[PDB]
Point group: none
Chain length 73, copies 10
Amino acid sequence: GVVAAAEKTKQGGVLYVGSKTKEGVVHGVATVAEKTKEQVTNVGGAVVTGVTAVAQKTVEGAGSIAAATGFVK
Amino acid sequence: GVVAAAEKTKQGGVLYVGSKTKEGVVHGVATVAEKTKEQVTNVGGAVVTGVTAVAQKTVEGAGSIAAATGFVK
Amino acid sequence: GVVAAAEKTKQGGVLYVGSKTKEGVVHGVATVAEKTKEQVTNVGGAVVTGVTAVAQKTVEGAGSIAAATGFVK
Amino acid sequence: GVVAAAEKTKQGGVLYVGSKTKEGVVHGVATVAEKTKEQVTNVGGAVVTGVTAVAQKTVEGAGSIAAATGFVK
Amino acid sequence: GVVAAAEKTKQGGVLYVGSKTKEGVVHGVATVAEKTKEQVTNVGGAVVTGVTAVAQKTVEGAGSIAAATGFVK
Amino acid sequence: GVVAAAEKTKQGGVLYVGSKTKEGVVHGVATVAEKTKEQVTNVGGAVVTGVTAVAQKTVEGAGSIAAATGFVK
Amino acid sequence: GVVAAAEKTKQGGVLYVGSKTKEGVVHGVATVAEKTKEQVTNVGGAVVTGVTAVAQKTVEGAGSIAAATGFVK
Amino acid sequence: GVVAAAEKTKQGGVLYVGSKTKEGVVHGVATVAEKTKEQVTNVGGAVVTGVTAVAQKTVEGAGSIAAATGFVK
Amino acid sequence: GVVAAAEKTKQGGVLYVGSKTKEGVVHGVATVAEKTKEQVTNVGGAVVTGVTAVAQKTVEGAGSIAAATGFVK
Amino acid sequence: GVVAAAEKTKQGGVLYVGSKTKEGVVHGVATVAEKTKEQVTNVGGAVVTGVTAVAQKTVEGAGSIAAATGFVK
């Protein structure tokens, strides 16, 4: 049983990033593989993958990830 | 049983990014594979993949991911 | 049983991104594969894949993903 | 049983993006594959894939994805 | 049983994007494949695929996707 | 005395140019000027001003140019 | 006395250029000037100003240029 | 006395250039000037100003240039 | 007395250049000047100003240049 | 007396250049000046100003340059 449950219940600055760049090569979440069986990638949050990657107030509630892999049995 | 459940119940700054870039090569969530069986990619949140990637107040409620892979049995 | 359930119940700044770029090559969620069986990609949230990728207040409720892959049985 | 259920019940800033770009090559959700059996792509949210990709207040309720793939049985 | 159910019940800023671009090549949700059996693409949300892709207040209720693929049995 | 005199008295291979181009902007003999008095341009030979400019066996006899300019006296 | 005299008296391979180009901006003989009095340009030979500029056996006899400029006296 | 005299009296391989280029900006004989009096440009030979500039057997006889400039007297 | 005289009297291999370039900015004979009086440019030979500039057997006879400049007297 | 005289009287291998370059900025004969009086440039030979500048058998006879500048007297 692969169960994920998420609940969010609500009973209700200055940020400068000045970037100047030449030749930016950026990889983020990279799974490189030869001779494989499973390649599972769950993003329950935030993958912010710039050359200028700004993430403000980003992942702010009830993330639930249930990964079950393999299980030859 | 692969169950995902999400509930969101509601009983109800300055951000400068100045980027100047030449030759930006950006990869984000990359699964590169030879001789595989499963390539599963779940995005229950945010994949923000710029050269200028800004993500403000982004993933703010009730993300649920239930991944079940393989299971030869 | 592959079940996904989502419920959202409601009983009810300044962001500058100045980008100047030359030669932007951007990949986002990329699954590259030879000799495969399954390539599953679920986006229950947001894949924002610019050269200037801005995502404000984006993924704000009740995302549910139920992925079941393989199951040779 | 591949079940997806979504319910949304309702009992009821300044964003500048100035982009100047030359030679933008953008891929988003890309599944490239040789010798495959299934290529499933579900978008229950938002795939915003510009060279200038802005996504404001975008994925704000009751996304449900139920993917079941393979099942040789 | 491949069931999708969606219910939406209702008992009831400034965004500048100035883009100046030359040579924009944009792909969005791309499934490229040789020697395949199934290519399923469900869009229960929004695929906004400009060179200037703006998506405001977009995916705001009751998305349900039930994908079942393969099932050799 | 501005004298030009020319006399020509006669008592009597493989050239491949493969050009493939995009966006060619070509200027040749350009005299750009503000607040001037004389703009003299004599061509006693050859001004070959292509994007693909080939000149074979071109200027082969008795060119004479006599330019006298100004002379406030 | 501005005298030019030219006399030509006659008592009588493989060249591959493979060019592949994008975005060629070419200037040749350029005289750019503000607040000037004389702009004299004599071409007694060859100005070959391509993006692919080939000049074979070109300037092969009796070029004479007599330029006299200014002379306030 | 500004005298030019030219006399040409006649009593009578493999060259590969493979160029592959992107973004070529080429200037040749450029005279850039503010607040000037004389801008004299004599070409008694060859100005070959390509992005691929080939000049074979080019300036092969009797070039004569007589430039006299200024002479306030 | 500004005298130029040229006389040419006639009583009668493999060259590979493989160039592969990106972003070539080329200046040749450049005279840049503010607050000037004379800008004299005589080319009695060869100005070959490519990104791929090949000059074979080029300046092979009787070049004569007589430049006289200034002479306040 | 500014005299130039040239006389040419005639009583009658393998060269590989493999160049692979990125970001070539090339200046050749450059005279940069503020608050000047004379800018004289005589080319009685060869100015070969590539990013790949090849000059074979080039300046092979009777070059004569007579430059006289200033002469306040």
